[PDB]
């Protein structure tokens with residue numbers, strides 16, 4: 001599923017991301033725009049043999065099992081396929097664990113480089129939330 005901007009904002013709000021560990025909703029919408037272009041089915045292969053999955057491009061080395069990343073810790077206890085669903089529940093639950101782990105949203109390369117220190121409120125402007 002390719003989300004609309006305001007559609008995704010509302011889904012993310014319902015799932016408890018607004019101000020989760022101090023990150024406003026705009027941060028999460030901006031991260032999803034630049035990680036996946038709001039596409040739940042986005043996959044990207046890394047040089048280390050790992051793969052990033054779904055709307056928040058969660059990585060197969062630490063967070064999910066895709067059966068082809070030797071020494072996956074599978075810390076979210078989920079097949080990586082579950083992260084590609086039109087229902088973002090699994091992606092949200094796993095993201096909450098990632099953003100808790102120490103480095104916060106800096107775990108997302110696209111957030112650090114394209115969202116961090118910008119007017120992220122622009123991403124939820126015009127939305128009925």
Ligand SMILES: [Cl-]
Nearest residue numbers: 024025026121
């Ligand atoms: Cl915001």
Ligand SMILES: [Cl-]
Nearest residue numbers: 021103104105
């Ligand atoms: Cl933080």
